[PDB]
Amino acid sequence: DYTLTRIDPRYPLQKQEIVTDPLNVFMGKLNDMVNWGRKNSIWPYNFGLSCCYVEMVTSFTAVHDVARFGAEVLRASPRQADLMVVAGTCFTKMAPVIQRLYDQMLEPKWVISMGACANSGGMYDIYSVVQGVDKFIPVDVYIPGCPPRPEAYMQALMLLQESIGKERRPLSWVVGDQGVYRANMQSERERKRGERIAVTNLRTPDEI
Amino acid sequence: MTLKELLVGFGTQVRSIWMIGLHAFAKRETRMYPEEPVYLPPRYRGRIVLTRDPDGEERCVACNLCAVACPVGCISLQKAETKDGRWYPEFFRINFSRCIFCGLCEEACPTTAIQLTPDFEMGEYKRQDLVYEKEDLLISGPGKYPEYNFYRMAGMAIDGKDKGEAENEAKPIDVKSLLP
Amino acid sequence: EPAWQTRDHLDDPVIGELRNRFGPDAFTVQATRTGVPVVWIKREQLLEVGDFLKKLPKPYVMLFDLHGMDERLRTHREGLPAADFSVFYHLISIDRNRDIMLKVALAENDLHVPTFTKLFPNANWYERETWDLFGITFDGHPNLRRIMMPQTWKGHPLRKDYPARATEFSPFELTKAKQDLEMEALTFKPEEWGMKRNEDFMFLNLGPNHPSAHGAFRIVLQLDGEEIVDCVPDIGYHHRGAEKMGERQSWHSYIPYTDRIEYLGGCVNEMPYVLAVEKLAGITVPDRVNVIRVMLSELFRINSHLLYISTFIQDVGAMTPVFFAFTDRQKIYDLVEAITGFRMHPAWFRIGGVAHDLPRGWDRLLREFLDWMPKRLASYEKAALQNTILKGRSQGVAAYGAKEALEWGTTGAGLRATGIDFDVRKARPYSGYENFDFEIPVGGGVSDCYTRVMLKVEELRQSLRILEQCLNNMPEGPFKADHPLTTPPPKERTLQHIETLITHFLQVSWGPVMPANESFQMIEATKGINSYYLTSDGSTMSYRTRVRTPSFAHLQQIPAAIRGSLVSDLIVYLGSIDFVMSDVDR
Amino acid sequence: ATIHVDGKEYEVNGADNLLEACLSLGLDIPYFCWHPALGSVGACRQCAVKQYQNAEDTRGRLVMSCMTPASDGTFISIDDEEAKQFRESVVEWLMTNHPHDCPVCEEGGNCHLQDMTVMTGHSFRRYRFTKRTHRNQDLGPFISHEMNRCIACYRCVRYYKDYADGTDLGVYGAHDNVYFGRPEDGTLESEFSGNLVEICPTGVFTDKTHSERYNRKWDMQFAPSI
Numbered sequence A: 001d002y003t004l005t006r007i008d009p010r011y012p013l014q015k016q017e018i019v020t021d022p023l024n025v026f027m028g029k030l031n032d033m034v035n036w037g038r039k040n041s042i043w044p045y046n047f048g049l050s051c052c053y054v055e056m057v058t059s060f061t062a063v064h065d066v067a068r069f070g071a072e073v074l075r076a077s078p079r080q081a082d083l084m085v086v087a088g089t090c091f092t093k094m095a096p097v098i099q100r101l102y103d104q105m106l107e108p109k110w111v112i113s114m115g116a117c118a119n120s121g122g123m124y125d126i127y128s129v130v131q132g133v134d135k136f137i138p139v140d141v142y143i144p145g146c147p148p149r150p151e152a153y154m155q156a157l158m159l160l161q162e163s164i165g166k167e168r169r170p171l172s173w174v175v176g177d178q179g180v181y182r183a184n185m186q187s188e189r190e191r192k193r194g195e196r197i198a199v200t201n202l203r204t205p206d207e208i
Numbered sequence B: 001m002t003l004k005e006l007l008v009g010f011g012t013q014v015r016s017i018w019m020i021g022l023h024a025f026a027k028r029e030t031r032m033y034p035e036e037p038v039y040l041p042p043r044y045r046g047r048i049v050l051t052r053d054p055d056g057e058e059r060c061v062a063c064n065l066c067a068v069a070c071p072v073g074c075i076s077l078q079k080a081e082t083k084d085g086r087w088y089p090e091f092f093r094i095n096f097s098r099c100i101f102c103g104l105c106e107e108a109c110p111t112t113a114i115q116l117t118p119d120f121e122m123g124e125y126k127r128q129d130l131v132y133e134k135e136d137l138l139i140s141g142p143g144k145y146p147e148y149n150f151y152r153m154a155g156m157a158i159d160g161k162d163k164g165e166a167e168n169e170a171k172p173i174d175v176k177s178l179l180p
Numbered sequence C: 001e002p003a004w005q006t007r008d009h010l011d012d013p014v015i016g017e018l019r020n021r022f023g024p025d026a027f028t029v030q031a032t033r034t035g036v037p038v039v040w041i042k043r044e045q046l047l048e049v050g051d052f053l054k055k056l057p058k059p060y061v062m063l064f065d066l067h068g069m070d071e072r073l074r075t076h077r078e079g080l081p082a083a084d085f086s087v088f089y090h091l092i093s094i095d096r097n098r099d100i101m102l103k104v105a106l107a108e109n110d111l112h113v114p115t116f117t118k119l120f121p122n123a124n125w126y127e128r129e130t131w132d133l134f135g136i137t138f139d140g141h142p143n144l145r146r147i148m149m150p151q152t153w154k155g156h157p158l159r160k161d162y163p164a165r166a167t168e169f170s171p172f173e174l175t176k177a178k179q180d181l182e183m184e185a186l187t188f189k190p191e192e193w194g195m196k197r198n199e200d201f202m203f204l205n206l207g208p209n210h211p212s213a214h215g216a217f218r219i220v221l222q223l224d225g226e227e228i229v230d231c232v233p234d235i236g237y238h239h240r241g242a243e244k245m246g247e248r249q250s251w252h253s254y255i256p257y258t259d260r261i262e263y264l265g266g267c268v269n270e271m272p273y274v275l276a277v278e279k280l281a282g283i284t285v286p287d288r289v290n291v292i293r294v295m296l297s298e299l300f301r302i303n304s305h306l307l308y309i310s311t312f313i314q315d316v317g318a319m320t321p322v323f324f325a326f327t328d329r330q331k332i333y334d335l336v337e338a339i340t341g342f343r344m345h346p347a348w349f350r351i352g353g354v355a356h357d358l359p360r361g362w363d364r365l366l367r368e369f370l371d372w373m374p375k376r377l378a379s380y381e382k383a384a385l386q387n388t389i390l391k392g393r394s395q396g397v398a399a400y401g402a403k404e405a406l407e408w409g410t411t412g413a414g415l416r417a418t419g420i421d422f423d424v425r426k427a428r429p430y431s432g433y434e435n436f437d438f439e440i441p442v443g444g445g446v447s448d449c450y451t452r453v454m455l456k457v458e459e460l461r462q463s464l465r466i467l468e469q470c471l472n473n474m475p476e477g478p479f480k481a482d483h484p485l486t487t488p489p490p491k492e493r494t495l496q497h498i499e500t501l502i503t504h505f506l507q508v509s510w511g512p513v514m515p516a517n518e519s520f521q522m523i524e525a526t527k528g529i530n531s532y533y534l535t536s537d538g539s540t541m542s543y544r545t546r547v548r549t550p551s552f553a554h555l556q557q558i559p560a561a562i563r564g565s566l567v568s569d570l571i572v573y574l575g576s577i578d579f580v581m582s583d584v585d586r
Numbered sequence D: 001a002t003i004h005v006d007g008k009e010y011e012v013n014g015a016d017n018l019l020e021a022c023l024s025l026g027l028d029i030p031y032f033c034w035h036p037a038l039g040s041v042g043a044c045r046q047c048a049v050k051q052y053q054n055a056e057d058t059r060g061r062l063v064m065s066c067m068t069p070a071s072d073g074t075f076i077s078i079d080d081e082e083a084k085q086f087r088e089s090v091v092e093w094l095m096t097n098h099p100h101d102c103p104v105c106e107e108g109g110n111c112h113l114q115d116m117t118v119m120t121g122h123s124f125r126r127y128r129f130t131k132r133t134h135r136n137q138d139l140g141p142f143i144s145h146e147m148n149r150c151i152a153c154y155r156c157v158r159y160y161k162d163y164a165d166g167t168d169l170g171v172y173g174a175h176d177n178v179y180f181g182r183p184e185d186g187t188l189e190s191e192f193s194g195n196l197v198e199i200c201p202t203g204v205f206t207d208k209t210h211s212e213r214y215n216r217k218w219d220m221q222f223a224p225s226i
């Protein structure tokens, strides 16, 4: 239930192959503590594109306080940031800029697509809009919504957090397997279908 | 600058520092997600579900008004008929990666089968799991409209409802009746 | 006579002046529902008519709009000059409080118009916009380059034969060679853009990625040391193709697309579109609908002004009012979620009314926000706006007078900071805005960043006054019109009547059949004057959807005011315009 | 011939009636009973226009455009207030018994009565009493019968008897209990029974083969073929 990805220069220039989990208990504890340190301090990239960025900075404020998860540093350079949040629409003019900003980031990096625009092009099935950000970069966590509410962005942040907590990365570049292992977790749809179906009644829309 | 502007500027910096300290002696405005659940209004546009009749059947009649009223075109379904003649969707899928939660489908539904619950946690790992089939849309209850039934208003005859048994429908008068 | 009635405005004094100047048969009047006189003039007399309107006793000092229109597929062209293309110019005379629409007919082959930049400098970007999307060439333009799309593009999208959807195109392949040529196309070389480079001018590039809330775009800078000597904005990095999209969606389904034109307006952006559609359909909304729409527009205006003040204060350097103002935005979002059901983009307005009735208890949340706001606004002022460091950063930076604001098309607080009292809500009252007691602020005559900021603060206070007036006396009645073209009909009558169900069935599926006519409506948006011009050919789709936005004019005004300053003044000016890139590009 | 519609002069074929002459000019006149291939019988009373005797006549008289010959120098009005009120009233009178079946009907989106109710502007219902109902008939494997949705426009009987010379379908009943169909349950015998799915302006006769795998008209990828 794991996928091995390696990059070696149609985009992206990487291939995914289904590989079983190899995971020395010392190396396992080291990987767990490395993943814990990586997931408890996620440094996003300040990338202002569209509406979904405005809702992202609405998540970034005091009334929501995404700072509680250690995700508030918000570096303006792609080198200093770990996470790329594509919070907007992938226009044809802005697609190479997005690709370059993704390229200048460094391993480890993660990608969160925010909104229907970054998910699949969304409501703008138009000549100047690229239908989805996954056409040219890999995506880790998708969020639907136009815009997704801020608490949904924190929900995707926790989703990426336990995605990071169960993945295997090389500790050093001089010893070990350099390929990136990502767990094929069970999706939230059939996981939440156990209690989504049992919903019977909701509050009527004539009240506050 | 003169000395007067310098003293005025020093006073304004001290005033700003004092007001920031006064806000520091205030109460926190943070709503602690996920420990504190988010209060959402009843008409909040969130996750799309398909509701049910009060009798226990699915309320959709596969009339395809929501699919054409959807400006993104992220609805696909096919009409099927039972032995009695009632209409249901054979399948029903929504591309949630495409849906903008604009609520036009619920507004355009003439049976109030499809509704938008106040639920926002729909994030996903892969885009293939964002296509919600009919298994992930049909819920166990009527949702926001608890007592509506289209087949009670409908003129079509179905199981348990003969001709003339709907709302404001007289009994079928035969053409062979002896009354003038 | 209702306000949606078809008139030709033959009694307009400007029509009589043109009759006396150019003769009786030099042009042709057109009867529309736009509310303005529309005059079809010959192409060679266009500059003469422009000079005559510019040198009127009460002149038409403003070039409000300048665009083109593909008239090839238009069937109902009765009483109109024969044309395959047309070019329309909307010119506003503030002194008369009027406006005119001059239309020039063009054949399919002879697609050249004499330029209009010699009378209004905003015609530069307006004609680049017309050339970019229609291919119409303007004789004498300094540089007729594509403004929205890269120069390596084929065709013109707003032509009627162009494929609108990306699904019609191939899926977007980004190969190594494609990425190399696309990065090569974005490389800026001074001779093409007109920079014309002394061997000491430093060349600077800001963007296209933009770590701020107002979109993503590029500015190329020429620097004599630390002085900006020349700069030209690079836009089109947020082009969503909204007008061609408006040719694709129906009348009812287009409202979510009007939501995201400016993503800080919401219902303020929805308002002119539904107003123009109701002008097309001849729908007179009830007063309760007007008050509800006014309430939502004022709430979203307060939201946008709070965000603008927060981002400007953060651009100066104080980082705490962004947290407090976003908490205030959360309170506004609580009320908006309770009323409509979504935070930033409600899509809650409808043709002839609103989507639902108000929930029970909205007055409680409105009262809570109304007693929460003013002490926070006073604290905002006393903590950051009265700071002398912020004043030194902002006062006297990127200043212009009334002439520079008028000739560059600047509206909103940018125009009102010059002392010109021109607001849409008071000059041409719409949607029952005359039933509210409020004031229109004006500046001293200089459009500093500080003057615009205090203008928006006073506008926030007046919007609070309008919200209090709406909350105190709220009419009881219908939330939708009684017109048969009200889309959709009320839900319970759809659910238990048959002809109402039929009207719903044919209005949500095919779309309502607006009669073939033209309509226009401009409103005072959160960032200036936002206008919708809708031309219908009698179908269930808009034949032409023109959206004019004030951030376009402000971004074109940018080099005329920032010239001769440093780069920090440029950042302050950018933060103090209250624009977004989706407004400019759409 | 020469006609004047709303004061505007038009040149039309003098032999034809006013309905097809005005529909040839692109003018919109409501109609149910008249068909181009079947002639005029003046049944539905939907095609009402206001005809004036001369040019300087203001009162006029409500006539039916399908039974009015397009003679030379005719003066008629389509969008007159009384004519529009009468046409909306005829739509409403047809609406007093129409079942609430549009979501579950195959003619939805292809219904002449749907377009014709929307066109006349009738959207408010003030009929609170009961609606008549009829039992259906088994009309073979091709035509599905739903007698509730009929408006008694007499197109089916006219086509099937005068045009196609079919002998197994007809009208029975009385004042408002008219029944259009076979005298007993069975397959329709004519070889031209498929045209009833478009001759009928409502969804009384529907394509059962299409009704198995049904989708609406806007969902149809169409093409011309032989």
Ligand code: SF4
Binding pocket: A050, A051, A052, A087, A088, A089, A114, A115, A116, A117, A118, A122, A145, A146, A147, A148, B100, C260, C263
């Ligand atoms: S998904 Fe919606 S809110 Fe997000 S960028 Fe696109 S239009 Fe804006």
Ligand code: SF4
Binding pocket: B048, B069, B070, B071, B072, B073, B074, B075, B094, B098, B099, B100, B101, B102, B103, B104, B105, B106
């Ligand atoms: S909310 Fe809007 S975009 Fe989403 S499925 Fe419904 S109609 Fe389509």
Ligand code: SF4
Binding pocket: B059, B060, B061, B062, B063, B064, B065, B066, B067, B077, B105, B108, B109, B110, B111, B112, B113, B114, D103
């Ligand atoms: S509009 Fe409602 S009844 Fe019609 S197909 Fe959609 S969910 Fe089913």
Ligand code: SF4
Binding pocket: D149, D150, D151, D152, D153, D154, D155, D156, D157, D180, D199, D200, D201, D202, D204, D205
């Ligand atoms: S069954 Fe159809 S064609 Fe026959 S009278 Fe009724 S509506 Fe007209």
Ligand code: SF4
Binding pocket: D098, D099, D100, D101, D102, D105, D106, D107, D108, D109, D111, D112, D113, D114, D149, D201, D202, D203, D204
């Ligand atoms: S035939 Fe009757 S049920 Fe069917 S669409 Fe027409 S009016 Fe509605």
Ligand code: FES
Binding pocket: D019, D030, D031, D032, D033, D034, D041, D042, D043, D044, D045, D046, D047, D064, D065, D066, D067
């Ligand atoms: S169309 Fe003339 S009465 Fe029927």
